[PDB]
Write a protein that binds this ligand. Structure first.
Ligand SMILES: O=S(=O)(O)c1ccc(O)c(O)c1
Ligand SMILES: [Ca+2]
Ligand SMILES: [Cl-]
Ligand SMILES: [Cl-]
Ligand SMILES: [Cl-]
Ligand SMILES: [Fe+2]
Ligand SMILES: [Fe+2]
Ligand SMILES: [Fe+2]
Ligand SMILES: [Fe+2]
Lengths: 359, 359, 354, 355
């Protein structure tokens, strides 16, 4: 169990950007710019800096060329310059390695702290950032599939309660979770900015990065991404969806970048900013918890996720989950799911919903 | 092979209504009225008469209580009273059983002919119908999932080219179809009213009724149907979707009524009313043909369909398809499909797309 | 009254394209391509040929450079090649001037008949046209404001009953109209393809072209056109809307091109294909007939419209409407309208709504 | 000028509910429940307690039968019970009249402080509230016009800078405003929850309540409200819109309840939670600032607004604005507005846009 420091936690505002290492920068650019329509803040031979339609900070996504595709940093913006100092002190007390750069790790970020957190994830905390033209009313640029915000990250980690307690001490509040009747936690969602999530924990081998999520204004915008991917004959890069979530109540889609980094497109979750916001716990065997319409969760969604780097740029070693596997208990050979609690009708034994089994 | 009569074909306007036999009228009422929001034109202990939001004829759907759930009639409106006489002459020349009732078979229909057609299907042809209040501007009644029109029927039959040729002689024009490189036809779509389909043929054991389709105004209306069925904890009655079709380009959903009759909800196909409307043929192994986003077709979609009745109310005997099965050649153990023709990446062998095999 | 020819009417499928004369081709191209997103089928230094997202015929709009902005032709597709011969015999019997070009008037159209019709409008009838790539599943090209079909034309003419009867003889069926209790007709809508309209008649001084209409898939696509025009700081070229129509029940917007040609964007009217489709008549004083939400109709919408050309390319002389004016009877100084019939609450007198 | 207290400001989370006095409780019920689809948390013969589709606190709107239609309270939720003590100390030092009830003023609210604030408005601050079934996934109940959240209030007040400085001290941050080139401020928007606004100030005679605003998920939900009101033949209770705002960038509609209280329906503004969120200032003569599409703003939108009560239940006296009037300088007889700055084409002298 990760102890609560004496030092005060940094005041985190929100998730702000991710730095992803990619193997072919031009292929990646084609995906995030030509397919997804993200706005280029800066680019050169080594990096692409991208932002969403409504962003005023320099970027929400940095693509960095490197030999091994991986998450290099998931970056949170903090409330003041002094909060970056607080972050350094807090993580030092946790016994974590930290690196401080007064002039930033990436362009358009100033004083920044990166840490190898207790779950092995590379986090950044910063305040200073270059403001850019906020494109929120540039409807001359607006795409039929326009990505308007960065919304959240999702992390794969083998011990969800351990992580959850650490994120609670850092000031994140859990909005929803998935548990069973035998004491196992499979997933949790937690926030700072008053939406369902800024980060989320998914039970599995880790540290790995599950996805980064961007939002759209309306559901039809998500449908358009799917439609465009069909027209580009890259529908094989739609992993799962589109759907309605149980957890979060958002309409959603998961797609895969050229290095298999998973991106979620999301819209219309709900307000969580009250401190006693009712926490919602779903049972892992409820077949409406992940897709509210009951559609089956594709097995790659549970098994595949991105490598993460340490501060030297080396891939973090994976620690195997020993708690029960959500895949196995729901759609594997001994799995079970229900539509209506206690009703045998609409239940699934040892296979997925809608007449499918695991490939 | 079905000969083309010397007698003139009736001028068919559109699909107009279906009569389905249902086993429990109150449970069927709940589904069609309380879940789906269709509007009651007439009802009693034996039947419920339903119409869509923009309809002016008496009804689009008649639920008739009986012992065996089945299609009893699929009805087309013809242009003039004289076309009913033409339908009668045409089918008598084909050597089909016909029955004529000057005062209709169901309420709100007047002079009508029912026929056991050459494919075993119970067709009705009529002109006269009782006009009712057209609810098209009754936004005080409009539901978030409102069904606005009847769009089409889909019929299962063993020999698609044989049925197609017969429908062409009747004046239906083929818009899209699905074939393979060795000359098998798996499905065909054909219209009179200048949309993609008024009826459609799906290759399989027949005669059976695949579905009846209603349209909505917008894609979010279809999303709401899914969302409501989740809230009612009947997501197990969502069979397939929602999706974008390849064939037709419509946004779609398939759901199952209490007797397992399949209902499609559909919106935003394209104009086909020009006589040289370009036909579109798809390869059966193209994994974007049915769902444009490459999502897998649930196997029940290929295997299950409603019984149909003859003019005495007995179930029509089923005849086995001997051409190749669409299920088997795409998603069965020996099936295959592709995202990009010729590309092994994004292809599926011996299972469905997205990492599933047959349950 | 325009007599019915004994010659059979051509079988008209739908409205197909308009040829608009424009004064500055580059400015016009910026509006129809860069702002509105129509797809180029052909261009050169004299003309731009444009189509909507789901079209397979060569074009829905031809922009032709010329000295005076005007409608040059409103073209209907007919069902077979022989229907062009029918159209020629029909308009000849009507006493109208006609011109037949076996290889077409504009690129991508074959054998074509143009006429000065009895209302003074330049109509074209054709069958043959060059097919192009139908872009209906080209979602890589799809705009947030995408125009998906050509829907209809709207003509300004002084005597609506006279024009309506002429159109009915040609096979158009009236779907909706606007009348008063005194028996005046102010407008009528009529169709061939099974929607509310392929053309429509607006009472006023004519012949003038009121607008050309394109459809979108959804309401949000119309919203996006407005939002884009705001970002381009040309919100002054939004004339009226967005709104819900009473007549037609369609969601709508009216905008002005650089020569003040009016374009409607339109979605979600209803099916009219049955021969006994119920006809709806609105009262001219009903403030929900034009905009269902009761928003006022700007006077420019009633008074302004495009010149039309004769077959020589000269402007057609205009005839003044002598029947009552819809403008005057609803929003002029002696006009009125209501929200609920016979209720002075929500009524407007000598004054527009709201 | 309103001084800044030595006492620390309460930590305000968001606008939470409004209490509106209405004259005919049945007619109001019909509007808010039958037309608009709000959900009943509690009702009796004197009061209806309503909530939006995604709310879990007891209510977002209280309709209270009374003899004079008016705003009785605009309530903000604070982060902790001790924040209600802070609000009490803060307003006392301001020399504002306060009243504190441990068991609340309305049903479903616990310990609560009401104040007559320095602008004459009745604010409530509370933490304690009765939790109710969150209906956010009750799509069996979801209306085609569904109102999903309470978004904001908008207040009419004569001196916008005076008001702004006071709200800033209280911890609200200004996101957008409307000024001219002569030093006048006509309007300002400001927030706690990270949206464009929790409350907003409109320059005018006041204190008056301009409107209360509810959100929808999508733009088509607002369009459905208009379509329904047409079917119900009450399109005359549509005041302004639907439209796209300049300020806020939100899609919007303004409608009027049976006592003429103005309700806005609103969707899809942007995130403002960062402390250095760029402030946007519009010029008052910019014809895209209120409606981005340049549709004219009807003069009733500028002149009409609801009475507000003091803590005894009496109507607050109205103080006249002496700063220039937004109405007069844009759409009055000597008004002006532009489409493109510096372009005569698309400008309007002495009248509203669009004819
Ligand atoms: O403004 S109207 O409701 O009369 C109307 C209805 C349909 C149209 O296409 C139109 O331009 C005008
Ligand atoms: Ca268990
Ligand atoms: Cl999920
Ligand atoms: Cl399909
Ligand atoms: Cl405004
Ligand atoms: Fe997520
Ligand atoms: Fe279908
Ligand atoms: Fe029109
Ligand atoms: Fe507002």
């Amino acid at each position: 169990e990760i102890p609560k420091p004496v030092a005060p936690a940094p005041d985190i505002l929100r998730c702000a950007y991710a730095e992803l290492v990619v193997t072919d920068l031009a292929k990646s650019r084609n995906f995030y710019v030509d397919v997804l329509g993200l706005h280029v803040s800066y680019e050169d031979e080594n990096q692409i800096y991208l932002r969403s339609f409504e962003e005023f900070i320099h970027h929400n996504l940095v693509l960095t060329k490197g030999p091994v595709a991986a998450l290099k940093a998931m970056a949170f913006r903090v409330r003041t310059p002094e909060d970056v100092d607080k972050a350094e002190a807090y993580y030092q007390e946790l016994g974590c390695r930290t690196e401080r750069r007064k002039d930033g790790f990436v362009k358009g970020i100033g004083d920044a702290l990166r840490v190898e957190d207790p779950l092995g994830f590379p986090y950044e905390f910063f305040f200073e950032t270059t403001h850019v033209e906020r494109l929120h009313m540039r409807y001359d640029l607006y795409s039929a599939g326009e990505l308007v915000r960065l919304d959240h990250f999702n992390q794969v980690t083998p011990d969800v309660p351990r992580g959850r307690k650490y994120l609670e001490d850092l000031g994140f509040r859990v909005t929803e979770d998935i548990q069973d009747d035998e004491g196992t936690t499979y997933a949790a969602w937690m926030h700072r900015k008053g939406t369902v999530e800024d980060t989320a924990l998914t039970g599995g081998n880790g540290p790995r990065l599950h996805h980064v999520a961007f939002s759209t204004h309306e559901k039809h915008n998500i449908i358009q991404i799917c439609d465009k991917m069909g027209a580009l004959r890259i529908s094989d890069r739609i992993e799962r969806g589109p759907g309605r979530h149980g957890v979060s109540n958002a309409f959603y889609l998961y797609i895969l970048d050229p290095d298999n980094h998973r991106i979620e497109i999301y819209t219309q979750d709900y307000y969580t900013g009250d401190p006693d916001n009712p926490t919602i716990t779903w049972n892992v065997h409820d077949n409406q918890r992940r897709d509210w319409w009951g559609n089956p969760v594709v097995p790659s969604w549970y098994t595949e996720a991105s490598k993460v780097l340490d501060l030297d740029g080396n891939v973090q070693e994976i620690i195997e989950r020993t708690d029960d596997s959500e895949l196995e208990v729901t759609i594997g050979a001994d799995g079970f799911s229900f539509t209506r609690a206690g009703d045998e009708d609409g239940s699934y034994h040892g296979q997925a919903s809608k007449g499918f089994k695991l490939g």
